[PDB]
Design an enzyme around this catalytic site. Structure first.
Site, PDB file in Angstrom:
ATOM      1  N   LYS A   1       1.666  -3.142   9.195  1.00 51.81           N
ATOM      2  CA  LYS A   1       2.458  -2.052   9.080  1.00 51.81           C
ATOM      3  C   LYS A   1       3.798  -3.002   9.706  1.00 51.81           C
ATOM      4  O   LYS A   1       3.905  -3.703  10.393  1.00 51.81           O
ATOM      5  CB  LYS A   1       2.521  -0.957   9.945  1.00 51.81           C
ATOM      6  CG  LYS A   1       3.961  -0.079  10.414  1.00 51.81           C
ATOM      7  CD  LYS A   1       3.340   1.211  10.752  1.00 51.81           C
ATOM      8  CE  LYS A   1       4.458   2.254  10.507  1.00 51.81           C
ATOM      9  NZ  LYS A   1       4.199   3.611  11.288  1.00 51.81           N
TER      10      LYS A   1
ATOM     11  N   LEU B   1       0.786  -1.159   0.295  1.00 48.28           N
ATOM     12  CA  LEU B   1       0.055  -0.050   0.143  1.00 48.28           C
ATOM     13  C   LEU B   1       0.856   1.291  -0.079  1.00 48.28           C
ATOM     14  O   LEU B   1       0.450   2.395  -0.557  1.00 48.28           O
ATOM     15  CB  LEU B   1      -1.086   0.057   1.289  1.00 48.28           C
ATOM     16  CG  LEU B   1      -2.294  -0.913   1.299  1.00 48.28           C
ATOM     17  CD1 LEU B   1      -3.179  -0.734   2.489  1.00 48.28           C
ATOM     18  CD2 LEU B   1      -3.026  -0.490   0.008  1.00 48.28           C
ATOM     19  N   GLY B   2       1.969   1.072   0.764  1.00 46.06           N
ATOM     20  CA  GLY B   2       2.939   2.400   0.817  1.00 46.06           C
ATOM     21  C   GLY B   2       4.376   1.915   1.563  1.00 46.06           C
ATOM     22  O   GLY B   2       4.325   0.809   2.197  1.00 46.06           O
ATOM     23  N   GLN B   3       5.430   2.893   0.967  1.00 44.11           N
ATOM     24  CA  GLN B   3       6.636   2.389   1.469  1.00 44.11           C
ATOM     25  C   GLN B   3       7.260   3.913   1.725  1.00 44.11           C
ATOM     26  O   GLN B   3       7.383   4.775   0.972  1.00 44.11           O
ATOM     27  CB  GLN B   3       7.450   1.525   0.875  1.00 44.11           C
ATOM     28  CG  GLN B   3       8.591   0.721   1.805  1.00 44.11           C
ATOM     29  CD  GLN B   3       9.846   0.485   0.766  1.00 44.11           C
ATOM     30  OE1 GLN B   3       9.866  -0.150  -0.168  1.00 44.11           O
ATOM     31  NE2 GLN B   3      10.799   0.585   1.565  1.00 44.11           N
TER      32      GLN B   3
ATOM     33  N   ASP C   1      -0.203  16.346  14.872  1.00 45.55           N
ATOM     34  CA  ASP C   1      -0.268  16.416  13.370  1.00 45.55           C
ATOM     35  C   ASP C   1      -1.489  15.985  12.733  1.00 45.55           C
ATOM     36  O   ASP C   1      -1.713  15.353  11.704  1.00 45.55           O
ATOM     37  CB  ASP C   1       0.895  15.242  12.969  1.00 45.55           C
ATOM     38  CG  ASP C   1       1.310  15.482  11.736  1.00 45.55           C
ATOM     39  OD1 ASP C   1       0.903  16.400  10.802  1.00 45.55           O
ATOM     40  OD2 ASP C   1       1.822  14.578  10.921  1.00 45.55           O
TER      41      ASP C   1
ATOM     42  N   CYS D   1      11.323   4.845   4.323  1.00 39.66           N
ATOM     43  CA  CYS D   1      12.293   4.213   4.330  1.00 39.66           C
ATOM     44  C   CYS D   1      12.374   3.811   6.213  1.00 39.66           C
ATOM     45  O   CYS D   1      13.606   3.789   6.572  1.00 39.66           O
ATOM     46  CB  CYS D   1      13.674   4.985   3.947  1.00 39.66           C
ATOM     47  SG  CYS D   1      13.314   6.732   4.112  1.00 39.66           S
TER      48      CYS D   1
ATOM     49  N   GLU E   1       7.221  -0.601   5.708  1.00 42.27           N
ATOM     50  CA  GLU E   1       6.012  -0.943   4.456  1.00 42.27           C
ATOM     51  C   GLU E   1       4.577  -0.746   5.318  1.00 42.27           C
ATOM     52  O   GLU E   1       4.423  -0.944   6.572  1.00 42.27           O
ATOM     53  CB  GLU E   1       6.328  -2.114   3.633  1.00 42.27           C
ATOM     54  CG  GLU E   1       7.269  -2.032   2.756  1.00 42.27           C
ATOM     55  CD  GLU E   1       7.364  -3.427   2.046  1.00 42.27           C
ATOM     56  OE1 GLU E   1       8.173  -4.136   2.871  1.00 42.27           O
ATOM     57  OE2 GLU E   1       6.923  -3.696   1.111  1.00 42.27           O
TER      58      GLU E   1
HETATM   59  C1  LIG Z   1       5.301   5.956   4.573  1.00 37.31           C
HETATM   60  C2  LIG Z   1       4.251   4.974   5.161  1.00 37.31           C
HETATM   61  C3  LIG Z   1       3.803   5.212   6.482  1.00 37.31           C
HETATM   62  C4  LIG Z   1       4.963   3.636   4.945  1.00 37.31           C
HETATM   63  C5  LIG Z   1       2.847   5.246   4.143  1.00 37.31           C
HETATM   64  C6  LIG Z   1       1.870   4.362   3.702  1.00 37.31           C
HETATM   65  C7  LIG Z   1       1.229   5.075   3.067  1.00 37.31           C
HETATM   66  N1  LIG Z   1      -0.065   4.655   2.414  1.00 37.31           N
HETATM   67  C8  LIG Z   1      -1.109   3.956   3.418  1.00 37.31           C
HETATM   68  O1  LIG Z   1      -0.856   3.483   4.525  1.00 37.31           O
HETATM   69  N2  LIG Z   1      -2.228   3.713   2.578  1.00 37.31           N
HETATM   70  C9  LIG Z   1      -3.327   2.962   3.112  1.00 37.31           C
HETATM   71  C10 LIG Z   1      -3.449   2.745   4.361  1.00 37.31           C
HETATM   72  C11 LIG Z   1      -4.456   2.016   4.856  1.00 37.31           C
HETATM   73  C12 LIG Z   1      -5.445   1.751   3.851  1.00 37.31           C
HETATM   74  C13 LIG Z   1      -5.396   2.053   2.592  1.00 37.31           C
HETATM   75  C14 LIG Z   1      -6.468   1.807   1.716  1.00 37.31           C
HETATM   76  C15 LIG Z   1      -6.360   2.183   0.232  1.00 37.31           C
HETATM   77  C16 LIG Z   1      -5.175   2.551  -0.243  1.00 37.31           C
HETATM   78  C17 LIG Z   1      -4.154   3.142   0.862  1.00 37.31           C
HETATM   79  C18 LIG Z   1      -4.256   2.721   2.181  1.00 37.31           C
HETATM   80  N3  LIG Z   1       1.381   6.342   3.018  1.00 37.31           N
HETATM   81  C19 LIG Z   1       1.014   7.373   2.495  1.00 37.31           C
HETATM   82  C20 LIG Z   1       1.269   7.436   0.946  1.00 37.31           C
HETATM   83  C21 LIG Z   1       0.651   8.497   0.321  1.00 37.31           C
HETATM   84  C22 LIG Z   1      -0.392   9.346   0.977  1.00 37.31           C
HETATM   85  C23 LIG Z   1      -0.710   9.262   2.133  1.00 37.31           C
HETATM   86  N4  LIG Z   1      -1.543  10.279   2.877  1.00 37.31           N
HETATM   87  C24 LIG Z   1       0.042   8.252   3.020  1.00 37.31           C
HETATM   88  N5  LIG Z   1       2.483   6.317   3.748  1.00 37.31           N
HETATM   89  C1  LIG Z   2      -2.984   8.854  18.330  1.00 34.81           C
HETATM   90  C2  LIG Z   2      -3.690   7.879  17.509  1.00 34.81           C
HETATM   91  C3  LIG Z   2      -4.623   8.864  16.452  1.00 34.81           C
HETATM   92  C4  LIG Z   2      -4.504   7.023  18.033  1.00 34.81           C
HETATM   93  C5  LIG Z   2      -2.469   7.136  16.735  1.00 34.81           C
HETATM   94  C6  LIG Z   2      -2.562   6.126  15.794  1.00 34.81           C
HETATM   95  C7  LIG Z   2      -1.312   5.906  15.552  1.00 34.81           C
HETATM   96  N1  LIG Z   2      -0.852   5.023  14.508  1.00 34.81           N
HETATM   97  C8  LIG Z   2      -1.209   4.618  13.367  1.00 34.81           C
HETATM   98  O1  LIG Z   2      -2.032   5.438  12.719  1.00 34.81           O
HETATM   99  N2  LIG Z   2      -0.587   3.922  12.842  1.00 34.81           N
HETATM  100  C9  LIG Z   2      -1.003   3.476  11.329  1.00 34.81           C
HETATM  101  C10 LIG Z   2      -1.253   4.465  10.618  1.00 34.81           C
HETATM  102  C11 LIG Z   2      -1.649   4.291   9.254  1.00 34.81           C
HETATM  103  C12 LIG Z   2      -1.750   3.085   8.846  1.00 34.81           C
HETATM  104  C13 LIG Z   2      -1.117   2.079   9.542  1.00 34.81           C
HETATM  105  C14 LIG Z   2      -1.249   0.707   9.007  1.00 34.81           C
HETATM  106  C15 LIG Z   2      -0.850  -0.411   9.948  1.00 34.81           C
HETATM  107  C16 LIG Z   2      -0.481  -0.159  11.012  1.00 34.81           C
HETATM  108  C17 LIG Z   2      -0.557   1.203  11.824  1.00 34.81           C
HETATM  109  C18 LIG Z   2      -0.808   2.216  11.000  1.00 34.81           C
HETATM  110  N3  LIG Z   2      -0.467   6.648  16.279  1.00 34.81           N
HETATM  111  C19 LIG Z   2       0.827   6.677  16.544  1.00 34.81           C
HETATM  112  C20 LIG Z   2       1.377   6.629  17.930  1.00 34.81           C
HETATM  113  C21 LIG Z   2       2.986   6.738  17.912  1.00 34.81           C
HETATM  114  C22 LIG Z   2       3.637   6.806  16.878  1.00 34.81           C
HETATM  115  C23 LIG Z   2       2.956   6.657  15.644  1.00 34.81           C
HETATM  116  N4  LIG Z   2       3.885   6.732  14.468  1.00 34.81           N
HETATM  117  C24 LIG Z   2       1.610   6.719  15.380  1.00 34.81           C
HETATM  118  N5  LIG Z   2      -1.247   7.318  16.935  1.00 34.81           N
END
Ligand SMILES: CC(C)(C)c1cc(NC(=O)Nc2cccc3ccccc23)n(-c2cccc(N)c2)n1
Ligand SMILES: CC(C)(C)c1cc(NC(=O)Nc2cccc3ccccc23)n(-c2cccc(N)c2)n1
EC number: 2.7.10.2
Length: 261
Positions: A39, A17-19, A130, A21, A24
């Site tokens: 994640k 879905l995303g990467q 954020d 560094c 993923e």
């Molecule tokens: C750098 C890191 C944390 C590995 C990351 C991952 C992603 N993208 C996502 O996590 N995408 C998605 C997360 C959860 C559900 C999804 C469902 C459909 C498409 C993308 C999803 N990222 C992302 C890419 C592009 C735009 C946004 N807002 C977030 N960034």
């Molecule tokens: C405060 C709140 C909104 C409940 C929250 C949620 C998260 N963590 C995430 O949102 N993790 C993730 C964001 C987007 C896509 C994901 C996909 C798989 C696992 C975690 C994800 N948080 C978080 C906490 C500490 C460090 C980081 N980076 C993120 N914090």
């Protein structure tokens, strides 16, 4: 080990879905037929301790409008597993093919869900830091939930937070105001034409964005309330929520559909 811990072969990482560094994020399946987002940690990039500090926080935060922790694998390879939010991030959702059908009533409903997620953070004495459209996740039937992708967002940050480091729930309020301009312009970057330093300079002097085209003055007035200089003047998320939930009755009962809004 504890309640969250699940075996590795109970996961199927189907679609990348995303990467970044630091690792993923995959769409996946957990046991049978349970869509999940998974994640990953890129080995060597951060402490195993520090990576799992995220799920340590998500265990103590449970609410309908914050993305939910499902499972944790806590020896390498490690994985943090949450519910699947099928339509991706709110920023991409507003900009893409689907952003052109959203009208003020779907958008205000979206803001009300996020306020609700943020009212719970507020009642928990936590701080986001954020809050912006890039960190809101969307599911089916326009469900929105507060998230954190864990990436400088001066454009979304309060003066006391950007200049002096005073991040509080009152600074998340200021950003919610900025998130509101995101919804009403279909995802456009705030302070159009302006660079970070020009934004940081204009805002200190009293500049605040003007009412976006077709957006009702009463909604700009709420953004402006979220943008007071004095953090303590800013409204509460309990107030922001109730005001958005009640909106088309109490505030804009004569609302009429437009070209974009
Ligand atoms: C750098 C890191 C944390 C590995 C990351 C991952 C992603 N993208 C996502 O996590 N995408 C998605 C997360 C959860 C559900 C999804 C469902 C459909 C498409 C993308 C999803 N990222 C992302 C890419 C592009 C735009 C946004 N807002 C977030 N960034
Ligand atoms: C405060 C709140 C909104 C409940 C929250 C949620 C998260 N963590 C995430 O949102 N993790 C993730 C964001 C987007 C896509 C994901 C996909 C798989 C696992 C975690 C994800 N948080 C978080 C906490 C500490 C460090 C980081 N980076 C993120 N914090």
């Amino acid at each position: 080990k504890d309640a969250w811990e699940i075996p590795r072969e109970s996961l199927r990482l189907e679609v990348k879905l995303g990467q970044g560094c630091f690792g993923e994020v995959w769409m996946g399946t957990w046991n049978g037929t349970t869509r999940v987002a998974i994640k990953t940690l890129k080995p060597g990039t951060m402490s195993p301790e520090a990576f799992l500090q995220e799920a340590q926080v998500m265990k103590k935060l449970r609410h309908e409008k914050l993305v939910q922790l499902y499972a944790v694998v806590s020896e390498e390879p490690i994985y943090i597993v949450t519910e699947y939010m099928s339509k991706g991030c709110l920023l991409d959702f507003l900009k893409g093919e689907m952003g052109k059908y959203l009208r003020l009533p779907q958008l205000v409903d979206m803001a009300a869900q996020i306020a609700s997620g943020m009212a719970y953070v507020e009642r928990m004495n936590y701080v986001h830091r954020d809050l912006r459209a890039a960190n809101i996740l969307v599911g089916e039937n326009l469900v929105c939930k507060v998230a954190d992708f864990g990436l400088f967002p001066i454009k979304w940050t309060a003066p006391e937070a950007a200049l002096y480091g005073r991040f509080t729930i009152k600074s998340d309020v200021w950003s919610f105001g900025i998130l509101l301009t995101e919804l009403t312009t279909k995802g456009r970057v705030p302070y159009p034409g302006m660079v970070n330093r020009e934004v940081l300079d204009q805002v200190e002097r009293g500049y605040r964005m003007p009412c976006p085209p077709e957006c009702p003055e009463s909604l700009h007035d709420l953004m402006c309330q979220c943008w007071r200089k004095d953090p303590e003047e800013r409204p509460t998320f309990e107030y922001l929520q109730a005001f958005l939930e009640d909106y088309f009755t109490s505030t804009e009962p004569q609302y009429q559909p437009g070209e974009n809004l």
